[PDB]
Amino acid sequence: KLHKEPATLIKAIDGDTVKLMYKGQPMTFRLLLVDTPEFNEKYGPEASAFTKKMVENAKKHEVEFDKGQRTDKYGRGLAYIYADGKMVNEALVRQGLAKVAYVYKGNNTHEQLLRKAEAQAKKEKLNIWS
Ligand SMILES: Cc1cn([C@H]2C[C@H](OP(=O)(O)O)[C@@H](COP(=O)(O)O)O2)c(=O)[nH]c1=O
Ligand SMILES: [Ca+2]
């Protein structure tokens, strides 16, 4: 089992990065197991606005690291981010605003939960899958 840890929102950045204060330190977090389009690309504006609204409307923010590396090579935190108990990573996939991606062994605990979400977004022809 993974565990959720406290954070506070500093600011939204784009579809799959968000700035949070974690153990009292400002950090950029990159969402595990997803890829949103860059802001300049199609559905990038929509993905950014999704993640923005989801984190800005929540009152409680949490970080859940997986079993492997907790930071990437750019110094970004690698985690599942929750907003009022709802996983942002999974929400993005479910709405077709991210692809499951960057699935590395040992940091892949929620791989199947997200693939299930992606199949449903694809069935619904949502956004990326339209
Ligand atoms: C999501 C994720 C990205 N990354 C690295 C791989 C990619 O390397 P490159 O920068 O060399 O492409 C980059 C993609 O993140 P972005 O999609 O934010 O660019 O972040 C990891 O190392 N681990 C991860 O879990
Ligand atoms: Ca991206």
Residue 108 and residue 28 in contact, taking contact as beta carbons nearer than 8 Å = no
**Which ligand does the CA of 79 lie closest to?**
1
Q: What distance in angstroms lies between residue 102's CA and the mean position of ligand 1's atoms?
A: 7
Report which ligand 1 atom has the smallest distance to the Cα of 78: 25
Would you give the distance in Å from CA 126 to the centre of its chain?
Answer: 18
38 as an active site residue: the answer is: yes
Report which ligand 1 atom has the smallest distance to the Cα of 30: 1
Contacts of 12 (CB under 8 A, 6+ apart): 18, 19, 48, 51, 52, 55, 56
In angstroms, the Cα distances linking 98 to 6, 22, 38, 42, 69 are 25, 24, 10, 11, 22
Enumerate the known binding-site residues.
16, 35-36
- d(CA 12, CA 49) in angstroms, rounded, equals 9
Enumerate the known binding-site residues for Ca(2+).
16, 35-36
Would you give the distance in Å from CA 117 to the centre of its chain?
Answer: 13
- d(CA 88, CA 75) in angstroms, rounded, equals 20
Residue 36 and residue 97 in contact, taking contact as beta carbons nearer than 8 Å = yes
Closest C-alpha to ligand 1, atom 2 = 102
Q: What distance in angstroms lies between residue 26's CA and the mean position of ligand 2's atoms?
A: 20
64 as an active site residue: the answer is: no
Residue 79 and residue 109 in contact, taking contact as beta carbons nearer than 8 Å = no
The DSSP code sequence of 9-61 is: EEEE-SSSEEEEEETTEEEEEEETTEEPPPTTSTTHHHHHHHHHHHHHT-S-E
Quick one: which of 109, 104, 106, 128 has its CA closest to 118?
A: 128
Structural domain boundaries, residue 102:
1-130
**Which ligand does the CA of 39 lie closest to?**
2
Q: What is the CATH number of the domain that holds 25?
A: 2.40.50.90
User: What resolution, expressed in A, was reported for this entry?
Assistant: 1.7
Neighbour tally for 75: CB within 10 Å: 9
Indicate the number of domains in the chain: 1
94 as an active site residue: the answer is: no
